[PDB]
Amino acid sequence: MPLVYMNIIMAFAIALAGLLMYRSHLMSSLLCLEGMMLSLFIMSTLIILNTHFTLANMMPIILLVFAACEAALGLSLLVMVSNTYGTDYVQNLNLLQC
Amino acid sequence: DGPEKNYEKTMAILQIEAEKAELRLKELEVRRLMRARGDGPWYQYPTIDKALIDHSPKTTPDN
Amino acid sequence: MNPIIYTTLIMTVMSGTMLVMISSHWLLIWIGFEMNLLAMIPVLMKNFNPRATEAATKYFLTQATASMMLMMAIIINLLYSGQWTITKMFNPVAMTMMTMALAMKLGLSPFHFWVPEVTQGISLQAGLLLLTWQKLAPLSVLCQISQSINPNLMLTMAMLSILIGGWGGLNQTQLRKIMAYSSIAHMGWMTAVLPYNTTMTILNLLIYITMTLAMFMLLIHSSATTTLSLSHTWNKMPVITSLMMVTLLSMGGLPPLSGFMPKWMIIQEMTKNESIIMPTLMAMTALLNLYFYMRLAYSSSLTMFPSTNNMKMKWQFEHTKQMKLLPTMIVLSTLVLPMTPALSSLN
Amino acid sequence: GRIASFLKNAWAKEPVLVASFAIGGLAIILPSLSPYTNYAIRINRATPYNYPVPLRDDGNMPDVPSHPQDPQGPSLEWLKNL
Amino acid sequence: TMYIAFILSTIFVIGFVGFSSKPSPIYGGLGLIVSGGVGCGIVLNFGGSFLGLMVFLIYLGGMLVVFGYTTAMATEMYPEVWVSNKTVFGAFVSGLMMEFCMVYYALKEEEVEIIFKFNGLGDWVIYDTGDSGFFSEEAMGIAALYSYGTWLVIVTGWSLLIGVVVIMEITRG
Amino acid sequence: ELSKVTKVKTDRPLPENPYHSRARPEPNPEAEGDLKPAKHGSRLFFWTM
C-alpha cells in the first residue's frame, strides 16, 4: 500500500488511542471521536477516488453526516452532564458502578 | 397378551432405532463433507450476483 | 417526553435494527447502527436523572467507539477487496477489528463493563429494550459473517463472557445488575456456537429474549429494583413471585424448563465438531448463574421476608397497567422443552 | 370563512412565513403541472457526455444510422426551435 | 514536490497527535483544524476537490460550536497546552516519536510491514492514466445521490430529523 | 448529428473471448424430484415425531 494509507491508518489508530485514554474532560473524548471520523473520511475518500468507484463517491458524505450526528449527540450529553454536575469532568460519571 | 406380541414389537422398535442411528451417522458424514467441499445444497454461502454487472459501452475503450 | 415522540424514537430504533438485518451493503448496516444509537440515547434518558444521564453517556461512548472500529474494518475490507456486500471478509485484520467492534456492541467480555452500569442507570422499561432488542443487530451481523470469524477469538470471548457474567452476578443485590450479568453470560453462550451453527445462536437468542421479557415484565409488574423491594411482593402478589421463581429456574438451565433447550443444543453442536472441553467448561460455569438465580428465588418466593405495615393499603388496590404478552412469555420460557424438534423452522 | 380569517391573520402577524409556504408550495405542485419538465429531461439525455460507441453492422438494422449525417437516427430539430 | 501528499499526511498525523494528547479543548480545536485542512489538501491532490472542500467546510463549522462549548463547559481557570502538563507533553512527544519512527522505517526501508504491507514509493505511482473527458467524476458520482441513492437520501434525511428531535429531547431536563 | 450511434460494416471477425476469460467452473448439481417425508420424522434424540 502507499505510504499515505499508512499515515491515515496511523492517524486513526492515534485518535482511537486518545479516545480510549481519557484524562479529565468529556470534550476531548468527543474531539477524538471527530478525529477518528475525519480519518475514516479521508481513508474512504482516497480509496474511492483511487479505484474510480464513481457511484461510491457519495459514501464519504454520508459518513460525514452521521459523524456530525454523533457529534451533536455527544455535545447534548456533554451539556446535560455540565448542567447536572457543573463541570464536564469524566470523573463525575461515577454513580453507576461495576 | 402373548409372548410373541412383545417379540415382534421389540423387533420393529429395534429396526426403527437402528435406522435412526445409521441415518444420524450418515447425516453427520454428509454435513462434514458438504462443509469441507461446499459442493452440495448446504453451506452455500452467497456470492456476488452476476446480474448486477453492466454489460454496456463504458466511457474508456479498455473497459 | 411526548408519547408521539417516544413512539417515533422506538420506531426509529426498530427501523435501525431492521436496516441492519435487511440491507446487503456495509454502509447501510453502519447507518442502521448509527440510527439505533441516535434513537436509543433519548430512550435511555426518558426519565431524567443524573444516573440516567451517566448511563446514556457511557452507552453513547461505548457504541460510538464500536461503530468507529466497525467502519474502519469496513473501509479496510473495501480497500483489500473493493466490495461492500456482507460476505466472507477478505482481510484478517479487518475481520479482527470488526469482531472486536461487534463484541463491544453486544457487550461480550472484556467489553462487558458498560452493561451492568448502563442497565442499572436506566429504568426497567429501557433496560428491557437494552437487554433484548439491542442484541438483535450485532448478532445478525455476526451470523452473516460467521464463516470469516476467527473461531479462537470468538470462543475466547464467549468463555470469558460466561465466566465474568457468572462471577459478576454473585456479588449483585440490585436486580438490574443481576439481569445485566445474566445477559452477558447468555450472550457468551450464544456466541459460543456462532462459528459452528448459527441456527443454534438464533434459538438461544429467542429463548433468552423470551426469558428476559418475562423477567423484566414481572419486575415492572412488581415495581421492584432490589432484592429487598422484590421480597415484599410475596405478600401483595404471591403469583408474581412464584412465576418469577419458575422463570429464574428456567434461566438457570434446569430441565424440564425451556432454558435447558439452548444449552443442550449448543452442547450437542459443539460436541459434533469434536469440541468437548469448551462445552463442559461452559456447562460447569453456568452453575454460578444458577446460584444467584436460586439466591433470588429464596429471597423472593421460596422463603418469606418481613413486610411493612403500609402494604395493607396496597392490598385493596388492583394493578391498572396490563401487559398482554406476559403470560405468553412466561409459558414460552418455561414449558417449551417438549417442542425442540421445532428447531428446523429456524433453518 | 375560517380559512380567510386565518390567512388574513397570518399575513398580518407573520407575513414572512406566509410567503415561504406559498413559494415552497408552488415549488412542489408546479413542476408536475408543467409541459416543459419532459423537455428538461430530453435536453439532459440529448447532451452527449460520452462517446457514441458504434455497433457492428449485421445487415438487419434498418433504423440504426450507418452514416455521417444521413436522415436515419434521432434528431435535435425540436431543441433548435425551443 | 513529488511527495506533497506524504508531507500533508505527516502533518495530518501531527495534528492527530496534537488533539489526541488532550490539551485544553481550545487547542484541540486548532489541532483538528490543521488536520482537517491538511486532509482537504490530500483529497484535493488525489482529485477530490468537492470532497476535500466538503470536509474542510463542515469541520470548520463544527469545531466552531465545539469552541463555543469549550468556553462554556470545558473552561478551566488555567487552560492547559501541550507544554503545560507532563502527561499532555508526554503523550504529544510519544505520538511525534511514533510518527517519526514509522516514517523513517517506511522511507529508508522501502517495503515496511507493521500491520499491513506498505510500499515506500511515492503515491504518484498508484495514479491511473485514464481520461475522464468532460467530467468531474467525483462530482458526478456525488450528484448521483439524488438519482441513484434515493434510499440513502431518505435514510439520511430521516436520521437528521430524528437527530434534531433527539437533541431537543436530551436538552430538556 | 455527430453524437448519433452508427453502424460500422467491417470484415474483421468479432472477438470470441475479448476478456481472455478462463473456463467457468462447473455449477453445483441442481435439485432433484419430488419431496417425501423424513424417514422417521425428526431424528432428534428421543423424539419419535
* Parent domain of E92: 4-172
Give the DSSP letter string of E51-63. HHHHHHHHHHHHH
In SS3 terms, chain D reads as CHHHHHHHHHHHHCHHHHHHHHHHHHHHHCCCCCCCHHHHHHHHHHCCCCCCCCEECCCCCCCCCCCCCCCCCCCCHHHHCC
**CA E52 to centroid of chain Cα atoms:** 10
Residue F8, beta-bridge partner list: D56
A4 — contact with chain C (CB < 8 Å)?
A: no
Task: Please list the residues that pair with F7 across neighbouring strands.
Answer: D55
Question: Cβ distance E11 to A5 under 8 Å?
Answer: no
Contact of E93 with E52, CB cutoff 8 Å = no
Q: Read out DSSP for A16-41?
A: HHHHHS--SBHHHHHHHHHHHHHHHH
Residue B7 corresponds to which cell in the numbers above? 417379540
Cα distance between residue C204 and residue A14, in whole Å: 38
Question: Is cis: bond before D31, omega within 30 of 0?
Answer: no
DSSP line for C39-69: HHHHHHTSS--HHHHHHHHHHHHHHHHHHHH
Q: Please indicate if any CB of chain E lies within 8 Å of the CB of C39.
A: yes
What is the end-to-end Cα distance of chain F in Å, rounded?
75
Rounded Cα–Cα distance for residues C253 and C287 (Å): 9
F4 half-sphere exposure, CB direction, 13 A CA radius: 18
For residue A7, CA distances in Å to B58, E11, E31 come to 34, 9, 16
Q: Find the distance separating the first CA and the last CA of chain E, reported in whole Å.
A: 55
C-side interface with B, Cβ within 8 Å?
83, 85, 87-88, 147, 272
Q: Are E136 and E49 in contact (CB under 8 A)?
A: yes
For residues A15 and E32, is the Cβ–Cβ distance under 8 A?
Answer: no
Q: Are strands F7-8 and E117-119 parallel, antiparallel or unpaired?
A: unpaired
Task: Mark whether F and D touch (3+ CB pairs within 8 Å).
Answer: yes
* Contact check, Cβ <8 Å, E162/C12: yes
Query: What is the C-alpha to C-alpha distance for residues C256 and A63, in angstroms, rounded to an integer?
Result: 50
CA distances (Å), origin E134, targets E40, E44, E139: 24, 18, 12
Query: Could you tell me the three cell numbers for C326?
Result: 406476559
Residue of B nearest to C85 (CA): B48
How many CB pairs below 8 Å do chains B and F form together?
17
Those of residues 35-64 in C touching chain F at CB distance below 8 A are none
Q: What is the resolution of this structure in A?
A: 2.9
Distance from CA of A25 to the nearest CA of C (A): 13
Q: Kindly report the CATH number that applies to the domain delimited by A3-92.
A: 1.10.287.3510
How many residues does this entry show for chain E? 173
Indicate the residue of C19, C41, C93 with minimum beta-carbon distance to E170. C41
Residue-wise DSSP of C63-110? HHHHHHHHHHHHHHHHHHH---BSSS-S-HHHHHHHHHHHHHHHT-TT
Grid cell for residue C145: 459473517
Return the residue of A nearest to E15 by Cα: A11
Cell numbers 505511482: residue: E125
D50 contacts on B by Cβ (under 8 Å)? 59
Q: Using H for helix, E for strand and C for coil, what is the string for C170-190?
A: HCCCEHHHHHHHHHHHHHHHH
Q: How far is CA C243 from CA C27, C222, C225, in A?
A: 44, 12, 17
DSSP code at position A56: G
User: 3-class DSSP state for residue C122?
Assistant: coil
Can chain D be said to touch chain A, i.e. do they have 3 or more Cβ pairs within 8 angstroms? no
Q: Which of E115, E166, E172 sits opposite C38 (nearest CB)?
A: E166
- Neighbour-count burial for E5-31, b at 16+ CB within 10 Å, e otherwise: bbebbbbbbbbbbbbbbbbbbbbbbeb
β-partners of residue E111 are E119
The CATH number assigned to the domain holding E21 equals 1.20.120.1200
**Cβ atoms of residues C305 and C299 within 8 Å:** yes
Contacting partners of chain E (3+ CB pairs under 8 A):
A, B, C, D
In the three-class reduction of DSSP (H, G, I as helix; E, B as strand; rest coil), residue C25 is classed as strand
Grid coordinates standing for E114? Answer: 507493521
Using DSSP, state whether F7 is helix, strand or coil: strand
- CA proximity to C148, closest of C67, C73, C68: C73
d(CA C228, CA C26): 47
Mutation for C interface: F40, F42, F49, most C CBs within 10 A: F42
A11, A69, A20, A17: which is closest to A40 by C-alpha?
A11
Task: Give the cell for residue C28.
Answer: 447501510
- The 8-class DSSP code of residue C300 comes to I
> DSSP state, A55?
G
**Contact status, residue C87 vs residue B47, Cβ threshold 8 Å:** yes
Helices vs strands, H then E, count in chain E: 6, 2
Question: Quick one: DSSP state of residue F24?
Answer: P
Count of the separate structural domains present in chain E: 1
Residues C44 and C122: beta-carbon distance below 8 Å = yes
Who contacts B31 (Cβ-Cβ below 8 Å, separation ≥6)?
B42
Number of CB atoms found within 10 A of residue C217's CB: 21
Q: Is C137 left (phi over 0), alpha (psi -120 to 50) or beta?
A: alpha
Q: Which residue has the cell 414389537?
A: B9
Helix (H), strand (E), coil (C) string for C247-274: HHHHHCCCCCCCCHHHHHHHHHHHHHCC
Q: Answer yes or no: are the C-beta atoms of C338 and C263 closer than 8 Å.
A: no
Place of cell 445521490: E145
Instruction: Report chain E's C-alpha Rg in angstroms.
Output: 20
Identify residue D39 by its one-letter amino acid code. Answer: Y
Distance of CA A92 to the CA centre of its chain: 22
Residue D31 φ/ψ, nearest 5 degrees? -55, -40
Q: DSSP label at E68?
A: H
Helix E86-108 × helix E4-20 angle, to 10° = 160
Question: C175 near C227, Cβ under 8 Å?
Answer: yes
Please choose, from the candidates E171, C42, E67, the residue with its C-alpha nearest in 3D space to the C-alpha of residue A82.
E171
User: What are the chain A neighbours of E105 within 8 Å (beta carbons)?
Assistant: none
* C-alpha atoms less than 13 angstroms from C-alpha of F35 in its C-beta half-sphere: 2
Question: Is the Cβ–Cβ distance between C79 and C139 less than 8 Å?
Answer: no
List the grid coordinates of D41: 429531461
Separation of alpha carbons E111 and D70, rounded Å: 60
Task: Report the C-alpha gap between E73 and E6 in whole angstroms.
Answer: 37
Answer for the pair E43, A46: CB distance below 8 angstroms, yes or no: yes
C13 in Cβ contact with C38 (< 8 Å): no
| Residue in B closest to D55 by C-alpha | B57
**Cβ neighbours, 10 Å, residue D64:** 17
Contact by Cβ (8 Å): E44, E21: no
The number of beta carbons lying within 10 Å of the beta carbon of residue C323 is 15
Q: Which of residues 11-50 of D touch F (CB under 8 A)?
A: 48
**First-to-final CA distance of chain D:** 45
For the record, the C-alpha cell of C151 comes out as: 473461531
| ∠ Cα C266 C268 C274 (to 5°) | 105
Alpha carbon of C343: minimum distance to chain F alpha carbons (Å): 10
- Residue window 11-40, chain F: list those with CB within 8 Å of chain B: 28-29, 31, 39-40
Q: Tally the residues of chain B.
A: 63
From residue C167, give the alpha-carbon distance in Å to each of C118, C178, C209. 18, 10, 22
Q: Cell 445474566 sits at which residue?
A: C182
**Residue E42 neighbours by CB under 8 Å, 6+ apart:** A4, A42, A46, E5, E8, E9, E12, E52
- CA dist., res. E94 & res. E99, Å (int): 9
Sketch the domain layout of chain A as residue ranges: 3-92
From B43's Cα to the closest Cα of chain C, the distance in A is 10
Q: Taking the alpha carbons of C299, C305, C308, C310 in that order, is the dihedral positive or negative?
A: positive
